[PDB]
Amino acid sequence: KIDFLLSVIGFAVDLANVWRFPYLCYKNGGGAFLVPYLLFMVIAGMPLFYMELALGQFNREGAAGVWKICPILKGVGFTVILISLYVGFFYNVIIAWALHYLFSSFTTELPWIHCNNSWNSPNCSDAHGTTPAAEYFERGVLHLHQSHGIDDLGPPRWQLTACLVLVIVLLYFSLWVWITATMPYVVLTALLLRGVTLPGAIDGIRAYLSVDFYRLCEASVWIDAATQVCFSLGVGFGVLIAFSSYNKFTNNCYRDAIVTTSINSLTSFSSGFVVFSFLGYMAQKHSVPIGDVAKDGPGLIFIIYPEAIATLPLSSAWAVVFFIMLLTLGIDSAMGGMESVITGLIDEFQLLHRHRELFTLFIVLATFLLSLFCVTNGGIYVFTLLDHFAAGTSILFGVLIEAIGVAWFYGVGQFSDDIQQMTGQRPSLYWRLCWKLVSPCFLLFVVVVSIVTFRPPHYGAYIFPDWANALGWVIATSSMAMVPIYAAYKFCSLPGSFREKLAYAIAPEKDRELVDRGEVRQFTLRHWLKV
């Protein structure tokens, strides 16, 4: 009842709809990003959500223990864990920035209002060049002007290192909801009501709701939309399976999938609406076009929202409340992502059941030491590289392998009966077709297009060198290469001839009685042709 609805709210809003979605909408065409996003959502965001929810609820294992249905494909369980670790590495930095801004908001005069300060260049325009908020961010919080690229980083900054330490301590002691869940909705509604009334908001709304029919012919908005759907829904991170492994057996995993995706899409739409409504007003007030008012990067919202707060009556209170909300949202997301990895590695190995605090300490210390790279002078370059290369092709490859392993090796007709065991009904033809044919081919197309059509990352005008791209590709392939290695190890470890090795490697562990009598279900084509 109310506990069910309060659980949907927690999954409906996260840091991926407030921080990344508007920045990806602005980077691509305004309104040309909403067509691939909605198409990919409808096609392969509900089937995958349903699949992971049901798999976790039925097999009662975190991330790699659910692969008793196909022992040879356990490498995706480690791939998703590596992806989660990589994501958390740069996920901590956003919380550090939010803490910095929250501490800086306790003033009678906000520091990002005018440019008379010591961190301002002559190229600053006051309501007329660079805006005071972007200059304040870059040259007072990041100190980006002292870095000459990714090959020249410098020592870490002592102001942001303290925030990172505080975030790490809080996360560890939280890992070892009535107020925390309904605060972002109130804040976003208030911001939307404010931004609707601003003089130049209609132009931004029109640019947001207009679809450009020439930006859809480029193979970048599709990849961005697919990766953003994966980021927002949590598919491909190992989080949904781990969360659902604790749910009741006779739980309706279909209604949850139907409702959570709808509410998530509505929240994403509202966030983009607010951001573009403020962008239009800024562009009108600065006498510049909408596309030439900011840079495409993870500095949006951090540049926009302070300027929106500055126009409210008592701006200090609004700023404090907004940054507290952002801090809580980021903490929740990071703690969930880290708990996924911790529980997966605890379930996998047996010695660690006597190493709980001494394992969480190791994980958080490694995360802190790896996040220390992004608090240097040139940390935004490392942030951009990580954001481009940690997920994307690797996460889509992992999702494709998971879908293939569940729908072709185990069997969609057996998955349906497993669902019908816990819930009184079984999936219809639409769900089975989407699981078996529609989703895998689209995922394969997106993966192939992403690999063949490579676009180097950039931050405004800086173009990354060759070795940066090589290191990024190594980082991306490190998690992807976990499937063939485990497959080869599993094949070589099992005893018997080739046929017996294959039979024990592809058949489920609950079918050993049938396999021992020469009754392998995967040695006939009726099993592979059945939808």
Ligand X SMILES: Fc1ccc(C(OCCN2CCN(CCCc3ccccc3)CC2)c2ccc(F)cc2)cc1
Ligand Y SMILES: *[C@@H]1O[C@H](CO)[C@@H](O)[C@H](O)[C@H]1NC(C)=O
Pick out the residues of the known binding site. Answer: 10, 12-14, 17, 84, 88, 228, 231-232, 264, 268, 329, 332-334
User: Could you tell which of ligand X, ligand Y, none binds residue 116, using a CB distance below 5 to 8 A set by kind?
Assistant: ligand Y
Q: Is the dihedral of CA 39, 45, 47, 50 positive or negative?
A: negative
Between residues 10 and 65, which has the closer beta carbon with respect to ligand X? 10
Subset of 193-252 contacting ligand Y (CB under 6 A): none
Smallest distance from ligand X to CB 222, Å:
21
Smallest distance from ligand Y to CB 126, Å:
6
Between residues 129 and 456, which has the closer beta carbon with respect to ligand Y? 129
Contacts with ligand X by CB under 6 A lie at 7, 10, 14, 84, 87-88, 91, 234, 237, 239, 242-243, 332-334, 336-340
Q: Which residues contact 357 (CB under 8 A, 6 or more apart)?
A: 176
User: Could you tell which of ligand X, ligand Y, none binds residue 334, using a CB distance below 5 to 8 A set by kind?
Assistant: ligand X
Binding of residue 128 to ligand Y (CB under 6 A): no
Count Cβ atoms within 10 A of the Cβ of residue 479 and give its class: 0-12 exposed, 13-18 middle, 19 or more buried: buried
Between residues 88 and 411, which has the closer beta carbon with respect to ligand X? 88
Q: By C-alpha distance, which of 402, 340, 381, 374 is closest to 463?
A: 381
The binding site for dopamine comprises 14, 84, 88, 231, 333-334
Three-class DSSP category at 213: coil
Smallest distance from ligand Y to CB 115, Å:
7
Q: Would you tell me how many other CB atoms lie within 10 Å of the CB of residue 482?
A: 20
Between residues 117 and 180, which has the closer beta carbon with respect to ligand X? 180
Alpha helices, H only, 287-378: 304-309, 315-348, 357-371
Gyration radius (Cα) of the chain, Å: 24
The binder of ligand Y chosen from 108, 123, 197, 497 (CB under 6 A): 123
Smallest distance from ligand Y to CB 122, Å:
5
In this structure, what token pair is assigned to residue 237?
A: 């991170």
Q: Give CA–CA dist 502/521, Å, rounded.
A: 12
In this structure, what token pair is assigned to residue 424?
A: 């009184």
User: Could you tell which of ligand Y, ligand X, none binds residue 123, using a CB distance below 5 to 8 A set by kind?
Assistant: ligand Y
Smallest distance from ligand Y to CB 303, Å:
17
Between residues 244 and 377, which has the closer beta carbon with respect to ligand X? 244
Instruction: Report how many residues bind ligand Y under the rule CB under 6 A.
Output: 4
Smallest distance from ligand Y to CB 302, Å:
21
Exposure on the CB side of residue 49, measured as CA atoms within 13 A = 25
In this structure, what token pair is assigned to residue 136?
A: 């304040």
Q: Which DSSP string do the residues of 104-152 spell out, in sequence order?
A: HT-SSS-TTS-S-STT--S---S-----HHHHHIIIIII-GGG--STT-
DSSP 298: T
Binding of residue 493 to ligand Y (CB under 6 A): no
Q: Which DSSP string do the residues of 449-466 spell out, in sequence order?
A: HHHHS----EETTEE--H
Stretch that binds ligand Y, among 99-107, 120-128, 409-417, 463-471 (CB under 6 A): 120-128
Spatial contact of 294 and 275, defined as CB atoms under 8 Å apart: no
Quick note: the x/- pattern for ligand Y over 88-117, rule CB under 6 A, is: ----------------------------x-
The binding site for chloride comprises 228, 232, 268
Q: Is the dihedral of CA 298, 300, 301, 305 positive or negative?
A: positive
Between residues 171 and 293, which has the closer beta carbon with respect to ligand Y? 293
In this structure, what token pair is assigned to residue 439?
A: 């989703």
Stretch that binds ligand Y, among 118-126, 264-272, 276-284, 334-342 (CB under 6 A): 118-126
Smallest distance from ligand X to CB 419, Å:
21
Binding of residue 122 to ligand Y (CB under 6 A): yes
Smallest distance from ligand Y to CB 117, Å:
9
Three-class DSSP category at 468: helix
Stretch that binds ligand Y, among 81-89, 119-127, 158-166, 286-294 (CB under 6 A): 119-127
Smallest distance from ligand X to CB 443, Å:
18
Exposure on the CB side of residue 328, measured as CA atoms within 13 A = 16
What residues line the site for ligand Y (CB under 6 A)? 116, 122-123, 126
